[PDB]
Structures are given as structure tokens and as C-alpha cells.
Amino acid sequence: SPVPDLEQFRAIAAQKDDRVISKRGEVKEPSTFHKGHKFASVSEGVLRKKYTKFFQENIKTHLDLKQALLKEEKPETALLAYSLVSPSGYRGEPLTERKILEVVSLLDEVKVEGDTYQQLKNTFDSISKDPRMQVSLENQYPGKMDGFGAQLLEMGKEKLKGSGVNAAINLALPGVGLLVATGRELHKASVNGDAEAYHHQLEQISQLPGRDQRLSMPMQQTLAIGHAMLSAEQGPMSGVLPRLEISNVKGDFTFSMQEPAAVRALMAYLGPKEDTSMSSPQAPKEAQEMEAARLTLKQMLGSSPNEHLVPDVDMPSQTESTANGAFKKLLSEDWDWLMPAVRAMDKGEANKINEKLTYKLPLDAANGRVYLDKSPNLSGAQLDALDKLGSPSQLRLMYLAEGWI
Amino acid sequence: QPLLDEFCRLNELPPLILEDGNRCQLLVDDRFVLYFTATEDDALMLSVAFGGLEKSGELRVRGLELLARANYQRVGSGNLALSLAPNGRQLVLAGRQPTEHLNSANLTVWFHEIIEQTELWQARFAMLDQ
Amino acid sequence: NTIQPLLDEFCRLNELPPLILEDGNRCQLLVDDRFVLYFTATEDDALMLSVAFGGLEKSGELRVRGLELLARANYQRVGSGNLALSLAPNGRQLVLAGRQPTEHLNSANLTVWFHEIIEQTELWQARFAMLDQ
Secondary structure, three states: OOOOOHHHHHHHOOOOOOEOEEEOOEEEOHHHHOOOOOEEEOOHHHHHHHHHHHHHHHHHHHHHHHHHHHHHOOHHHHHHHHOOOHHHHHOOOOOEHHHHHHHHHHHHHHHHOOHHHHHHHHHHHHHHOOHHHHHHHHHHOOOOOOOHHHHHOOOOOOOOOOOOOHHHHHHHHHHHHHHHHOOOOOOOOOOOOHHHHHHHHHHHHHOOOOOOOOOHHHHHHHHHHOOOOOOOOOOOOOOOOOOEEEEEOOEEEEEOOOOHHHHHHHHHHHOOOOOHHHHOOOOOHHHHHHHHHHHHHHHHOOOOOOOOOOOOOOOOOHHHHHHHHHHHHHHHHOOOOHHHHHHHHHOOOHHHHHHHOOEEEEOOOOOOOOEEEEOOOOOHHHHHHHHHOOOOOHHHHHHHHOOOO | OOOHHHHHHHHOOOOOOOEOOOEEEEEEOOOEEEEEEEOOOOEEEEEEEEEEOOOOHHHHHHHHHHHHHHOOOOOOHHHOEEEEOOOOOEEEEEEEEEHHHOOOHHHHHHHHHHHHHHHHHHHHHHOOOO | OOOHHHHHHHHHHOOOOOOOOOOOOEEEEEEOOOEEEEEEEOOOOEEEEEEEEOOOOOOOHHHHHHHHHHHHHOOOOOOOOOOEEEEOOOOOOEEEEEEEEHHHOOHHHHHHHHHHHHHHHHHHHHHHHOOOO
């Protein structure tokens, strides 16, 4: 039984996408098993043989990780952490140092308390069936599933007669149609150097009282630095989010929440207001499940069912557009103004933003104290628009940092 | 032109038959693909794709910055150079040498150097995250 | 002092002013009253032709534009393939440089090299001076 234990997987875990394989009791990079280099000539016989050879150890390595997890923890805890890599593992996809870092970080979280991530995973499992989420991924992933949503729109009851899911599908076809068109068709690497520094402020805002950290901070970290902050390198806890396991007519895909495109696809998919057709009790139970899971993540990021967020021109309500411009004014004029302003709005004291965010610089003077102050100088219309927003959703602030609104 | 037969026979290397566009390929340690292409200019160009660059964000900028300044130094013999593929993501390390100054023992030096340098740039571009 | 006989014949062959190494290391040539070409006799018995031109921006979309240009520039190089576009240590200036061992060099192939780095310099310099056209 030359199986590697969990410690040898933890040792190789790193924020890198290098393939590792389990072989002869240890897991590491395939080149490091031999002191020298090994060579082969490409040809039609060997590439099909080399691929089968790689496919077969990716699965063996995944199963050795699974076995190592099961030996160290209760099966319920070990299999919850392994679920992150199980569907991709079965397809011969390679186990990498980052996946192991994810799995091990996730295991350290569900060890103490697994209900939180189990809620997230069930929610992520439901939205993985949603065509709206799936076409949203197509927008951020050109090449992976081109034309899925478009050629999906040319369907009806004859093509898709079903009251298990195909009734849920048809109810989302309008939302699919709106969601394919909107955006840059790829969106964009919308960063100015400051968009990295903007998401740093959203991190602090995520840690404000009453605001979600479990979902928002990993998403914000990925958009800022390219990946989340994992445990082994409420609260952010492990920083691991579930996978988007997409099965459709285009194929079988797995999308990591550590990829920026996947975060952006989820972001756009959470924007629009509640689709009451799918939320209807009369609606198919599947459609009820997808929309309820979408509003769950949407609400987690502070976005109410009423909130409608779409990438536009850089549609929003008159008070929304003035509020978004007030947020942009704070972001471009100072580095530490957005968080205290969002805090003031969270307390219903948006009218006090100008005086609260004021910097007082005392000069040398006589007969009292003379100061030099800098204030955001938000207009009365802007303060009112901010006050009309109540608690600004983390999703809206995330839209702003990306330059979407 | 098929003079490499001494070089592979020298170091126990599998055959290198340049076919269907005078191209021949080798597999290094199950991770990299080496390309032995014959320039029309009587030169031997070695090229190996060794990884990927991030599609977007600050990770791409840091890799772009790393790629631009890396070619300033003498990275390798034969004017070995770092480059980005037309797809915008694959990292390519390529260099060439005129065949007239290429026997077999000198190939081995140039052959190990591209491998050693290909290993080093795969690691440095995978170690950008900090 | 090793490439000096080759540089002498190369200069005489091309009706060029004499290129004399200032203590056996480096010497420069004003090309077409436009830019300066450097002849560097490194220590390891090679000749280095290098041109430094233009300059990226300190930051912003234009700098990343030049970085994208720098990354793609050295892929499947034309002609000799003895040249590589790079960014200077100052992070701004662009450098077009190549180096060849002296054994590989005769007066004929040096003239071919000398003409390529010139046509490549005028090309890349114009290309980088018109980043946002």
C-alpha cells in the first residue's frame, strides 16, 4: 500500500498550476522522480499513448488524494473537501499544486464547521445548471463553449419538452437573451492599476459589520491579484469557493472561482433583479431552485432581489446613477474615503459623509486652533442619492471597482 | 541536413526524422516539446514552448515586464530569446545556430542549455505570484 | 583587438569610417545621421551589435501596449535570427541587440548582420513611436 498521506500533499501545495502525480508513495512533479531528463519522439502512436498515460495518473493521483483525505478525516469531512476536484478529476484533468492548496485549505475549514461551505456548494451546484450562468461563462470564456447560448435560443417545447428542467430552461431563455448581448462579449481586463487598489478597499469594506466575507473576499482577492488567499498558504476562513461544474450540449467543464473570468461571469449573472417568472411557486421546481440559489449569492453580496445591476456605459436609476458617480468621486480623489463612506451609509448616516470623511490638518496659529481641511465635497444631490441606497451592495461596489457602472 | 543522427546516437536520443514540412519534435520529461526546425538560411532553430501567461490583470503585466527585460541579458547561445505566441498566452523560448558551425558535440552544449534555460523560465514565470 | 582586423576589412569593404575599439572593448557608429550602432567586443570572443532607441511610458495603457509589443516581437524571428528586442534596465528605453561568436563571423556575414539590425531598428523604432498611432 504505497499511498502518500495527507502531509505529503500539504507539502507540495502552493499557489502554482504545476501538475503533480502520485507515484511510489510520494506526490510531486513528474520530472523530479528521476535525477536526469527523459526524452521521447512524437508520432501518431506515442501521443495517443502518452495522453492515455497522463490521463491514467491524473485519476490515480486524484484518488490517492481522496484516499489520503479519507484516512486523515471523517469520510463526510474528507469527501466534502474532495468534491472540489472530484468531477474534474474523473475526466483525467491534472491535479496541480494550487488545487491541492485549495483542497487542503477547504479541508481545514470544514473540519471545524462544514455547514457554511455545504450551503455554498449546494448553491453553486444549483447555479451550475442555470443556462444564464452558463452563457455568462461563455461570455468570459471565448473558445470554451462558443455559441452555446445563441444556438440555445432557437429552441422550444418540441426540442425541450420537460417539466423537470426543460420548463426551467424555457423560463430562462429571455434572461439568456439579455445576458448574451450585454457586455463587451468578453468584457475586459478592466484594470487601471488602481482597480487592484480599489479591490483592496473592498476587502476592508467586506470586513465591515454586517457584511459578508466568506464569498466577497475570495472574489475580490481573485480580481485584484489573480487568485484568492487560501487558508494553507463570519470570516474568509479557507478562502476556497466551490467549482462551477458545467454540463451542457457543448461539453463538460469545471471553472475555478480562483480564475478572474469565472468571478466576472458570476458577477454579471448576479446583477439583474429577481426574475419573478422563475421564482414563481407555479414555476418548475428546478427554475425555482436556480433563481433562489442566484438570489442567495446575490443577497450574500448585499444585493437585494430588487437590485438590478447591468454593465452599461462608462439604465441605472436616477438616484442610482448619481450614487455611482458619488462613489467614483470618492475613489478617484482619495485612497481611504470609500470605506468610511460605505460605513456611514451602512449606519444610515450618509448625510454625514462630508463631515465624517473630513481630514483636519492643524496649522500653527493663535487664539484658538486654525485647521486646513479636505472634505469629499459631495453635493447635496449626491448625499441624498447615497442615502437612498441604504446599505450599498458589495456587488455594486464590485461592479464599480471593475469599471462596469 | 539529417546530420543530427550522430547527435542523437551520441546521447541515446530517439530518432529525429524531419517530415511533412521538415519539422521534427522531441518530448522532454513529459512536460516540454522541443522543436528542431530547419531554417531556409542554413541554420538550426531550436524552439520550445514552456508555459502560459495570464490572460489579464496585474499577473499579465508582471509577466510582460519580466519577458521584456529578460531578453536584455544574454539568455542563451544562438541568440536565444523569450517571446509570446500569437495566441497571446504561450511563452516561447527560441534560438538558432548556423548549421556550418554545428557538429554534434557542440549541439549537446546548445541542447542542454536550452533545456536548462527552459526549466528556469518555466519556474520564474510560475513564481510571479508574490 | 580580436575583431579589429575583421572590423577593419568590414569598414573598408563598406566604405565606412574606421571602427576602433577604445581599449579593445566597445566602439560606436553613427548610422545614417539618425541613430548610433554599438560594436561591443565582449570578453567571451563574440561581437555584440546593439541599438538603444525610443522609450515606453512610466505606466498606463501605453506602457502595457509596448510590453505586449515587446513580448510578441521575438517570436519566430526573420532573417538571421541573431537579434532580440528587449527593454533597457532603466525600464523605459528599448534595445535591439544581438551577439555572435567571432569564429562565426567573416566580413561577408557581418555586412549582412549590420544591414539587418539597421532595417530592424528603423522598423521597431517607428513601430514603438506610433504605439497609439
